[PDB]
Design a protein around this motif. Sequence first.
Motif, PDB file in Angstrom:
ATOM      1  N   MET A   1      16.860  32.365   1.260  1.00 42.57           N
ATOM      2  CA  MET A   1      15.921  32.606   2.192  1.00 42.57           C
ATOM      3  C   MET A   1      15.788  31.361   2.861  1.00 42.57           C
ATOM      4  N   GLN A   2      16.080  30.078   2.294  1.00 45.17           N
ATOM      5  CA  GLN A   2      16.058  29.036   3.560  1.00 45.17           C
ATOM      6  C   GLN A   2      17.095  28.913   4.364  1.00 45.17           C
ATOM      7  N   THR A   3      18.410  29.553   4.036  1.00 42.19           N
ATOM      8  CA  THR A   3      19.406  29.742   4.794  1.00 42.19           C
ATOM      9  C   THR A   3      19.334  30.610   6.098  1.00 42.19           C
ATOM     10  N   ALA A   4      18.760  31.748   5.566  1.00 41.21           N
ATOM     11  CA  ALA A   4      18.275  32.800   6.550  1.00 41.21           C
ATOM     12  C   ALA A   4      17.433  32.241   7.697  1.00 41.21           C
ATOM     13  N   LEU A   5      16.513  31.677   7.266  1.00 34.25           N
ATOM     14  CA  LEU A   5      15.205  31.263   8.061  1.00 34.25           C
ATOM     15  C   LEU A   5      15.834  30.134   8.860  1.00 34.25           C
ATOM     16  N   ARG A   6      16.670  29.380   8.519  1.00 37.17           N
ATOM     17  CA  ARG A   6      17.117  28.304   9.588  1.00 37.17           C
ATOM     18  C   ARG A   6      18.031  29.005  10.681  1.00 37.17           C
ATOM     19  N   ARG A   7      18.688  30.159  10.504  1.00 35.33           N
ATOM     20  CA  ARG A   7      19.568  30.803  11.238  1.00 35.33           C
ATOM     21  C   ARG A   7      18.914  31.701  12.286  1.00 35.33           C
ATOM     22  N   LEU A   8      17.593  31.991  12.355  1.00 35.24           N
ATOM     23  CA  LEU A   8      16.796  32.829  12.942  1.00 35.24           C
ATOM     24  C   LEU A   8      16.865  32.370  14.403  1.00 35.24           C
ATOM     25  N   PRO A   9      16.935  32.858  15.510  1.00 34.51           N
ATOM     26  CA  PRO A   9      16.657  32.551  16.804  1.00 34.51           C
ATOM     27  C   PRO A   9      15.356  32.130  16.914  1.00 34.51           C
ATOM     28  N   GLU A  10      14.978  30.908  17.888  1.00 38.69           N
ATOM     29  CA  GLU A  10      13.757  30.258  17.777  1.00 38.69           C
ATOM     30  C   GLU A  10      12.673  31.216  18.639  1.00 38.69           C
ATOM     31  N   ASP A  11      13.027  32.162  19.369  1.00 35.40           N
ATOM     32  CA  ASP A  11      11.772  33.024  20.055  1.00 35.40           C
ATOM     33  C   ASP A  11      11.203  33.863  19.117  1.00 35.40           C
ATOM     34  N   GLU A  12      12.076  34.419  17.993  1.00 31.84           N
ATOM     35  CA  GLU A  12      11.675  35.275  16.968  1.00 31.84           C
ATOM     36  C   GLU A  12      10.928  34.242  15.866  1.00 31.84           C
ATOM     37  N   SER A  13      11.425  33.188  15.656  1.00 30.23           N
ATOM     38  CA  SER A  13      10.666  32.150  14.883  1.00 30.23           C
ATOM     39  C   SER A  13       9.318  31.759  15.196  1.00 30.23           C
ATOM     40  N   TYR A  14       8.937  31.552  16.609  1.00 27.39           N
ATOM     41  CA  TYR A  14       7.888  31.276  16.964  1.00 27.39           C
ATOM     42  C   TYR A  14       6.700  32.402  16.766  1.00 27.39           C
ATOM     43  N   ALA A  15       7.315  33.788  16.915  1.00 27.28           N
ATOM     44  CA  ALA A  15       6.397  34.772  17.030  1.00 27.28           C
ATOM     45  C   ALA A  15       6.299  35.250  15.429  1.00 27.28           C
ATOM     46  N   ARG A  16       7.027  34.895  14.572  1.00 25.59           N
ATOM     47  CA  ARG A  16       6.584  35.015  12.988  1.00 25.59           C
ATOM     48  C   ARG A  16       5.766  34.204  12.483  1.00 25.59           C
ATOM     49  N   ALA A  17       5.763  32.911  12.982  1.00 25.76           N
ATOM     50  CA  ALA A  17       4.661  31.755  12.779  1.00 25.76           C
ATOM     51  C   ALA A  17       3.119  32.239  13.130  1.00 25.76           C
ATOM     52  N   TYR A  18       2.957  32.866  14.311  1.00 29.35           N
ATOM     53  CA  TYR A  18       1.607  33.277  14.811  1.00 29.35           C
ATOM     54  C   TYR A  18       1.313  34.489  13.916  1.00 29.35           C
ATOM     55  N   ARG A  19       2.305  35.455  13.476  1.00 24.37           N
ATOM     56  CA  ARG A  19       1.608  36.595  12.706  1.00 24.37           C
ATOM     57  C   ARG A  19       1.364  36.135  11.439  1.00 24.37           C
ATOM     58  N   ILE A  20       1.835  34.994  10.657  1.00 19.36           N
ATOM     59  CA  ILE A  20       1.211  34.671   9.177  1.00 19.36           C
ATOM     60  C   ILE A  20       0.093  33.809   9.572  1.00 19.36           C
ATOM     61  N   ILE A  21      -0.204  33.154  10.655  1.00 16.51           N
ATOM     62  CA  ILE A  21      -1.364  32.305  10.761  1.00 16.51           C
ATOM     63  C   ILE A  21      -2.492  33.282  11.083  1.00 16.51           C
ATOM     64  N   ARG A  22      -2.317  34.317  11.803  1.00 15.63           N
ATOM     65  CA  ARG A  22      -3.500  35.404  12.122  1.00 15.63           C
ATOM     66  C   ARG A  22      -3.706  36.212  11.007  1.00 15.63           C
ATOM     67  N   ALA A  23      -2.915  36.379  10.047  1.00 17.03           N
ATOM     68  CA  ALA A  23      -2.822  36.994   9.047  1.00 17.03           C
ATOM     69  C   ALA A  23      -4.012  36.352   7.885  1.00 17.03           C
ATOM     70  N   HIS A  24      -3.892  35.098   8.000  1.00 21.08           N
ATOM     71  CA  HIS A  24      -4.587  34.313   6.933  1.00 21.08           C
ATOM     72  C   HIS A  24      -5.980  34.220   7.148  1.00 21.08           C
ATOM     73  N   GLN A  25      -6.359  33.857   8.760  1.00 20.24           N
ATOM     74  CA  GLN A  25      -7.335  33.787   9.107  1.00 20.24           C
ATOM     75  C   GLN A  25      -8.200  35.337   9.116  1.00 20.24           C
ATOM     76  N   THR A  26      -7.737  36.601   9.200  1.00 21.50           N
ATOM     77  CA  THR A  26      -8.333  37.791   9.085  1.00 21.50           C
ATOM     78  C   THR A  26      -8.790  37.914   7.663  1.00 21.50           C
ATOM     79  N   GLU A  27      -7.896  37.319   6.726  1.00 15.74           N
ATOM     80  CA  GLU A  27      -8.115  37.560   5.333  1.00 15.74           C
ATOM     81  C   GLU A  27      -9.326  36.951   4.916  1.00 15.74           C
ATOM     82  N   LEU A  28      -9.705  35.559   5.395  1.00 12.46           N
ATOM     83  CA  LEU A  28     -10.675  34.629   4.937  1.00 12.46           C
ATOM     84  C   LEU A  28     -12.207  35.115   5.486  1.00 12.46           C
TER      85      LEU A  28
END
Lengths: 431, 44, 62, 54, 126
Positions: free
Chosen positions: E55-82
Amino acid sequence: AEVTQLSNGIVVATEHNPSAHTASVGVVFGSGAANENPYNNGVSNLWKNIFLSKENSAVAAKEGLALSSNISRDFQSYIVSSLPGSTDKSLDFLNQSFIQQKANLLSSSNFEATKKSVLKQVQDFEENDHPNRVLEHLHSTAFQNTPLSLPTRGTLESLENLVVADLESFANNHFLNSNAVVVGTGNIKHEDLVNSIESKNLSLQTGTKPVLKKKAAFLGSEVRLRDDTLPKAWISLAVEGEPVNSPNYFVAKLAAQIFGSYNAFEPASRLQGIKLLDNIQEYQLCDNFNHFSLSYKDSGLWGFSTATRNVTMIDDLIHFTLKQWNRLTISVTDTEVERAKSLLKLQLGQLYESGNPVNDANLLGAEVLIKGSKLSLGEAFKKIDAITVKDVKAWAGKRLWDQDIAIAGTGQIEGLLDYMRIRSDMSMMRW
Amino acid sequence: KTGLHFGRLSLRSLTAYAPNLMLWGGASMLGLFVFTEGWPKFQD
Amino acid sequence: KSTYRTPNFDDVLKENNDADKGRSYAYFMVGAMGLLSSAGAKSTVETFISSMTATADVLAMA
Amino acid sequence: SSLYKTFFKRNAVFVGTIFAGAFVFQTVFDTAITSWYENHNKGKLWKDVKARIA
Amino acid sequence: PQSFTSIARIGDYILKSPVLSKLCVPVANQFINLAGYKKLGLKFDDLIAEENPIMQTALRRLPEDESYARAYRIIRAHQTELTHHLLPRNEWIKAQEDVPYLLPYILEAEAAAKEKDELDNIEVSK
Ligand SMILES: CCCCCCCCCCCCCCC(=O)O[C@H](COC(=O)CCCCCCCCCCCC)COP(=O)(O)O
Ligand SMILES: CCCCCCCCCCCCCCC(=O)O[C@H](COC(=O)CCCCCCCCCCCC)COP(=O)(O)O
């Protein structure tokens, strides 16, 4: 492909190749740097640069000839090259300049200019060429107080005491007819060479060379030359190996081919079928390494050299390499042996079938001086194909398992641990 | 060919190790050989 | 002087090296030490363990 | 020669023999000392007393 | 623990069968809606555990515009959970947006590690 040896008083060996476009003719002597003492060390390296001096090279160049010379531990050669239609002029030049007259070359004005040029070469070697001078220091610690320890170039301290009478004393003891082989390679036929020599009556001198009294002997030791202002570390390590005319000569070369060579910056070098590369590339433990199996007339050395910028993890690099050497006694597999067979045949075929007749003249003369003949490449391939896994395990149980080692190193070598921590890694306490 | 590589329990390396597990399972059965004899019990 | 000259080690070197004899005597002394240390550690544990068996006044009322 | 070959080299048999020789060592050592200790003190033990208080 | 090569082998066998894709596929749609990760604004490939070398290999090869959008969805889900809430209904992930964006990078890294393992433990024959 065929060699031809003939003796009429002078040993004459040839290797004819009618496809080549040049020819090469010279003489090889059976003395090297291991026939000197610690006070005239460097006298062979001075005789090479006298032969390659400017006035001697200018006489050859007006005829169309080129000159080469090589100094090793067991032999030395002096080679003239030409076009295939002028091998009679090249054999004349070897007669006048090197056999008959040597007071032309040993004049006082030519000797002082040559000695200045050699002293500058040895000084630049000791300051800049770090992989090759660590391997020179490995020979001097493994064979200390023994003729196989003297460096082939000489030292700066021993070269400045040399005079003209030291070079004439070496030539009267070693440049003899019973120590010499006349060689010919490239586009030259065998009976044309022996009739050109017999149309004259060449003879160097009658008699035999001196006999040294101490034989070579391996000693487990180490020498450390720490230099913190250098950017890398350079390390060599070896055990006692095989001499020439050994029955385990080809088995030792195949064992070194199993571990092989490596370059961290070449992408295809990173994909080789070597199990040691799994440990090294995980934390980038080195920049390059290479394994060797050297052989001389009386002894040999088997081991590896390496260069590293990761100076805090030097102890992991030595530990992983020596645990793979333990597997040659215990658990070497059949697919590793078959891979090493094909790569040893490719490496030997490239060494003996290059297109350079000067390389062929050095290899042919050195082998006839020791054995009296030359082994063909077809017969060497059949000895390699017959090696089994049980041959490898029996060789490594004698030469590798629980044996003494010799270490040399320079640069940032603070992380290299002491002798007994490295000596204890030559066995596993599992088997 | 090649077969089941066992992960790291390579069999090509099992019986390249296990003939000396007749003496490695025999070195700790050579071990309780020593450490069980302060009180009488016999077992073959 | 030159670093290729090795200093004098002759007052400690053996007259004949003979690698099979030097490794054999050193491994005899290390092997004898592991032999006696294992027999000493075994009796030590059995002295402490047997002190938890029934005492002499308990066995007299058997 | 090859005194090292099995007696110390094979370290499934070494750790094994480091443990193997120590077990027959306990009975021969305890028999030798007890026989020396009782012969040094002969005429004073209870078994030498019971043989003529009988 | 179970590889994605094994999951795709079982799953593509069901989807080609016309009788098995009428039974299991309605059950799988009810299973995903009851899971509830889309109401926190997540896609399924955001939920894959990443602490392994594949999984660390596959996350390195992801294009950077999709990597920025994945980071925002994870952060927004942590704030909604608390805050113990859900997102507004117009911010939920739709089914046509819940695509396997990371799956081709995972399957390529798994096939290369299998070929390396077969060449490292290998037999020969004359
Ligand atoms: C905490 C400060 C240290 C206090 C000393 C504590 C001593 C206990 C440690 C045991 C020391 C020997 C380690 C053995 C070892 O792993 O070396 C092993 C080697 O073992 C052998 O090859 C033969 C076995 C050695 C037998 C030594 C007998 C000592 C028995 C201990 C005595 C009772 C305490 C690895 O060491 P190496 O890398 O030098 O090869
Ligand atoms: C933790 C205790 C350590 C004690 C330190 C030594 C002081 C000497 C007193 C020994 C009293 C106990 C033995 C009495 C006895 O009867 O034994 C004797 C003598 O044997 C020995 O114990 C001497 C060896 C001492 C230990 C050597 C190092 C072993 C490695 C460390 C052990 C820890 C696992 C055996 O006689 P027995 O078998 O009839 O009982």
